[PDB]
Design a protein around this motif. Structure first.
Motif, PDB file in Angstrom:
ATOM      1  N   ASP A  88       0.833  -1.189   0.000  1.00  0.00           N
ATOM      2  CA  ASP A  88       0.000   0.000   0.000  1.00  0.00           C
ATOM      3  C   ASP A  88       0.874   1.247   0.000  1.00  0.00           C
ATOM      4  N   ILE A  89       0.578   2.166  -0.916  1.00  0.00           N
ATOM      5  CA  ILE A  89       1.228   3.468  -0.986  1.00  0.00           C
ATOM      6  C   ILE A  89       0.154   4.533  -0.833  1.00  0.00           C
ATOM      7  N   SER A  90       0.427   5.530   0.004  1.00  0.00           N
ATOM      8  CA  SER A  90      -0.517   6.599   0.278  1.00  0.00           C
ATOM      9  C   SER A  90       0.245   7.897   0.492  1.00  0.00           C
ATOM     10  N   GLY A  91      -0.462   9.008   0.348  1.00  0.00           N
ATOM     11  CA  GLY A  91       0.139  10.289   0.659  1.00  0.00           C
ATOM     12  C   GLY A  91      -0.671  11.430   0.075  1.00  0.00           C
ATOM     13  N   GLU A  92       0.021  12.549  -0.121  1.00  0.00           N
ATOM     14  CA  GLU A  92      -0.591  13.787  -0.572  1.00  0.00           C
ATOM     15  C   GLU A  92       0.308  14.441  -1.610  1.00  0.00           C
ATOM     16  N   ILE A  93      -0.311  14.978  -2.659  1.00  0.00           N
ATOM     17  CA  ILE A  93       0.374  15.726  -3.707  1.00  0.00           C
ATOM     18  C   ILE A  93      -0.224  17.125  -3.743  1.00  0.00           C
ATOM     19  N   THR A  94       0.631  18.144  -3.787  1.00  0.00           N
ATOM     20  CA  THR A  94       0.182  19.527  -3.899  1.00  0.00           C
ATOM     21  C   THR A  94       0.982  20.233  -4.980  1.00  0.00           C
ATOM     22  N   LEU A  95       0.284  20.760  -5.984  1.00  0.00           N
ATOM     23  CA  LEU A  95       0.907  21.585  -7.013  1.00  0.00           C
ATOM     24  C   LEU A  95       0.835  23.043  -6.575  1.00  0.00           C
ATOM     25  N   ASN A 129       9.246  32.245  -8.188  1.00  0.00           N
ATOM     26  CA  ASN A 129       8.517  32.608  -9.399  1.00  0.00           C
ATOM     27  C   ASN A 129       7.135  31.972  -9.328  1.00  0.00           C
ATOM     28  N   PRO A 130       6.062  32.764  -9.277  1.00  0.00           N
ATOM     29  CA  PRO A 130       4.714  32.174  -9.220  1.00  0.00           C
ATOM     30  C   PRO A 130       4.339  31.377 -10.461  1.00  0.00           C
ATOM     31  N   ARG A 131       5.015  31.595 -11.591  1.00  0.00           N
ATOM     32  CA  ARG A 131       4.748  30.810 -12.788  1.00  0.00           C
ATOM     33  C   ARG A 131       5.477  29.475 -12.783  1.00  0.00           C
ATOM     34  N   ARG A 132       6.521  29.339 -11.970  1.00  0.00           N
ATOM     35  CA  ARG A 132       7.270  28.095 -11.900  1.00  0.00           C
ATOM     36  C   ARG A 132       6.550  27.112 -10.990  1.00  0.00           C
ATOM     37  N   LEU A 133       6.426  25.872 -11.452  1.00  0.00           N
ATOM     38  CA  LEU A 133       5.647  24.872 -10.738  1.00  0.00           C
ATOM     39  C   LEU A 133       6.477  24.223  -9.636  1.00  0.00           C
ATOM     40  N   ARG A 134       5.891  24.130  -8.451  1.00  0.00           N
ATOM     41  CA  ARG A 134       6.465  23.384  -7.345  1.00  0.00           C
ATOM     42  C   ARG A 134       5.475  22.301  -6.938  1.00  0.00           C
ATOM     43  N   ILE A 135       5.996  21.128  -6.587  1.00  0.00           N
ATOM     44  CA  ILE A 135       5.177  20.010  -6.135  1.00  0.00           C
ATOM     45  C   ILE A 135       5.732  19.529  -4.806  1.00  0.00           C
ATOM     46  N   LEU A 136       4.898  19.548  -3.772  1.00  0.00           N
ATOM     47  CA  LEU A 136       5.251  18.973  -2.484  1.00  0.00           C
ATOM     48  C   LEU A 136       4.599  17.602  -2.386  1.00  0.00           C
ATOM     49  N   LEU A 137       5.406  16.579  -2.113  1.00  0.00           N
ATOM     50  CA  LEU A 137       4.945  15.197  -2.044  1.00  0.00           C
ATOM     51  C   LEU A 137       5.185  14.657  -0.642  1.00  0.00           C
ATOM     52  N   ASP A 151       4.419  -0.046   5.875  1.00  0.00           N
ATOM     53  CA  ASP A 151       4.482   0.461   7.237  1.00  0.00           C
ATOM     54  C   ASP A 151       5.747   1.267   7.496  1.00  0.00           C
ATOM     55  N   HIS A 152       6.490   1.616   6.447  1.00  0.00           N
ATOM     56  CA  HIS A 152       7.600   2.543   6.597  1.00  0.00           C
ATOM     57  C   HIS A 152       7.078   3.917   7.013  1.00  0.00           C
ATOM     58  N   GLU A 153       7.972   4.726   7.568  1.00  0.00           N
ATOM     59  CA  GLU A 153       7.574   6.032   8.067  1.00  0.00           C
ATOM     60  C   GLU A 153       7.232   6.973   6.913  1.00  0.00           C
ATOM     61  N   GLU A 154       6.291   7.880   7.173  1.00  0.00           N
ATOM     62  CA  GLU A 154       5.841   8.823   6.156  1.00  0.00           C
ATOM     63  C   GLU A 154       6.908   9.880   5.901  1.00  0.00           C
ATOM     64  N   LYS A 155       7.292  10.038   4.638  1.00  0.00           N
ATOM     65  CA  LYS A 155       8.369  10.934   4.245  1.00  0.00           C
ATOM     66  C   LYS A 155       7.833  12.056   3.361  1.00  0.00           C
ATOM     67  N   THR A 156       8.673  13.071   3.158  1.00  0.00           N
ATOM     68  CA  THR A 156       8.302  14.265   2.412  1.00  0.00           C
ATOM     69  C   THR A 156       9.441  14.674   1.489  1.00  0.00           C
ATOM     70  N   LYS A 157       9.096  15.073   0.263  1.00  0.00           N
ATOM     71  CA  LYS A 157      10.072  15.617  -0.673  1.00  0.00           C
ATOM     72  C   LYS A 157       9.443  16.767  -1.445  1.00  0.00           C
ATOM     73  N   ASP A 158      10.178  17.870  -1.558  1.00  0.00           N
ATOM     74  CA  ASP A 158       9.701  19.090  -2.199  1.00  0.00           C
ATOM     75  C   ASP A 158      10.424  19.273  -3.527  1.00  0.00           C
ATOM     76  N   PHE A 159       9.667  19.245  -4.619  1.00  0.00           N
ATOM     77  CA  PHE A 159      10.209  19.339  -5.965  1.00  0.00           C
ATOM     78  C   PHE A 159       9.930  20.714  -6.560  1.00  0.00           C
ATOM     79  N   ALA A 160      10.727  21.075  -7.562  1.00  0.00           N
ATOM     80  CA  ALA A 160      10.448  22.256  -8.366  1.00  0.00           C
ATOM     81  C   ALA A 160      10.842  21.980  -9.808  1.00  0.00           C
ATOM     82  N   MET A 161      10.290  22.788 -10.709  1.00  0.00           N
ATOM     83  CA  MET A 161      10.555  22.678 -12.140  1.00  0.00           C
ATOM     84  C   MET A 161      11.553  23.735 -12.601  1.00  0.00           C
TER      85      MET A 161
END
Lengths: 324, 321
Positions: B282-289, B295-303, B309-319
């Motif tokens: 099972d894989i679960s989480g949240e995606i936010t664009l 730059n407000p025109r540049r896309l960022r994605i927080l995952l 049962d591994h611990e919940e992790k976070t990674k912040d991406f940008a374009m």
């Protein structure tokens, strides 16, 4: 990090370039057996290992970028770290225990001289090479040919094909695309085939790496002149520039050549395309002549600039200044 | 520089999946467009405006702020449609139309849907010029996510172990180095995948309705949602792929790796390290664009993600031979 991975992945995955360097080195076993070698910009160290496979007693693999730590892993992984010593930092400041018998280096850039390591190789030749020492490769030859680029024709003809695909006539865009895709002053790196070559390729410059003062000619500009006659009628879009490097040994009248010509197997270097402002119609035996000078950019000496003087038959002589 | 402007529109029209989907999306709404007025936002070469005239529109206002509007004017004239399609230069925020319109058509989607998109221009035109309940082409955008085992990534990593057999030089240690670098970055990677890369049933985590006033405000706060999926089988999980689809009211244009490829490909979000998964993991989480803070025109994605049962992790991406 991934940029360094990409650069050296592309370098070694280039089968034509890597196999040529392997053969050029191994075919010089007589000059390398029991001798010392300096590898300028050793990258991952694969050329240094080829030298050791050719029988070198000692190899100094100099690499300034962070990939030298990978080169040491590779050298140690192959059980070679006692003969092959990966030394970090630029070759201009590194200190070797001795002058070397041979210099090996993968140094060619796009258009030969765009962000190339040639000057570092020449510094190492002056500082660390014994007199009469070996250089691998020993020389580079620059070629030029006029081209009728099929890919460009497709790009320009694309607008006339929209009506039959989607029912909208966009032939008026062809004139716009012709001016925009060719009016620029940028050197375009793309690979071509023999079907793009409009006349016999002409060698306009040869660079002998053993020459002193080759570096002061680098600042003054490396170039030469050419003349050719067109195979047939076609729209002349401009010129392709490419290079080859020649490895000594083996045979004195047919040494090993690694080429980036469109008539030869593809390499990651492809070719450097110089587009005229507009297409020029030419016919069979139309005479094209001119001069090409590979120059350092005024802003960045590492950035390649090419000044093209050319003349198409009856037409007046024109000049276009390109940059990478 | 002029080649930039031709290549963007050459790419757009050369994308068969996109151009044909827009063409049918417009032409299949002939009943709604017949005798109606249309606003084309970012009309570019005008190709969409001419599709609307063929669908029966009594008038199309083609608005385009870049210099290509002069070409669109010639395209319209060349097609003998200068009576119906009027190209108006300038940005849609300041252009003055004679009338509110029944329909808005626009090619506005960017990479990862919202990277340097024209969505905000479209929303401004909806507010200022679209009649109540007017037609939007497209009308909505659906965002999907799916875990992936990238076959191309494995192929690149596996090249280094093949050097010894061909050149007699062992370079296997580079495999550890390439995996760390090709994955440890925080950049959104634009790459196309196939069905063999998808590790689980793709999940829709957000939907954008272009008619809603206040969608512009919501975009500034970020858009996304939760997701849960079950893995198909054993494979190294490399991360997640994000893609979109736009729906034309009757009709979908998709950028999914399970569907024919588009110039948008998919947006790949790589984990720092591969994670082994198995069937029914099972894989679960949240995606936010999000708009990038620089730059407000540049896309960022927080995952945010949780595998098994591994611990919940976070990674912040940008374009090989």
């Amino acid at each position: 990090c991934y940029s360094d991975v990409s650069v050296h992945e592309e370098m070694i995955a280039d089968q034509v370039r890597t196999e040529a360097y392997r053969l050029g080195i191994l075919k010089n076993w007589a000059a390398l057996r029991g001798k010392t070698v300096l590898d300028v910009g050793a990258g991952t160290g694969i050329l240094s290992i080829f030298c050791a496979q050719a029988g070198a007693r000692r190899v100094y693999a100099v690499e300034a970028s962070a990939i030298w730590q990978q080169a040491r892993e590779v050298v140690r992984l192959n059980g070679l770290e006692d003969r092959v010593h990966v030394l970090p930092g630029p070759v201009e400041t590194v200190e070797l225990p001795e002058r070397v018998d041979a210099i090996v280096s993968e140094w060619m850039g796009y258009g030969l001289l765009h962000e190339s390591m040639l000057s570092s190789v020449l510094h190492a030749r002056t500082k660390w090479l014994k007199e009469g020492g070996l250089l691998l490769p020993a020389s580079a030859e620059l070629f030029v040919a006029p081209i009728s680029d099929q890919m460009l024709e497709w790009r320009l003809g694309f607008w006339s094909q929209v009506k039959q695909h989607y029912g909208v006539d966009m032939s008026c865009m062809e004139s716009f695309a012709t001016r925009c895709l060719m009016g620029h002053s940028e050197i375009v790196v793309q690979d071509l085939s023999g079907e793009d070559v409009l006349a016999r390729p002409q060698r306009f410059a040869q660079l002998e790496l053993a020459r002193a003062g080759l570096e002061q000619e680098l600042e003054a500009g490396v170039g030469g002149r050419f003349r050719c006659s067109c195979y047939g009628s076609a729209p002349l879009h401009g010129f392709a520039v490419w290079f080859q490097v020649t490895f000594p040994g083996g045979d004195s009248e047919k040494p090993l050549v690694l080429s980036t010509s469109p008539l030869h197997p593809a390499t990651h270097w492809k070719q450097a395309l110089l587009y005229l402002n507009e297409p020029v119609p030419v016919e069979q035996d139309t005479d094209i002549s001119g001069e090409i000078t590979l120059l350092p950019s005024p802003d960045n000496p590492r950035r390649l600039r090419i000044l093209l003087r050319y003349k198409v038959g009856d037409h007046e002589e024109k000049t276009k200044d390109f940059a990478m």
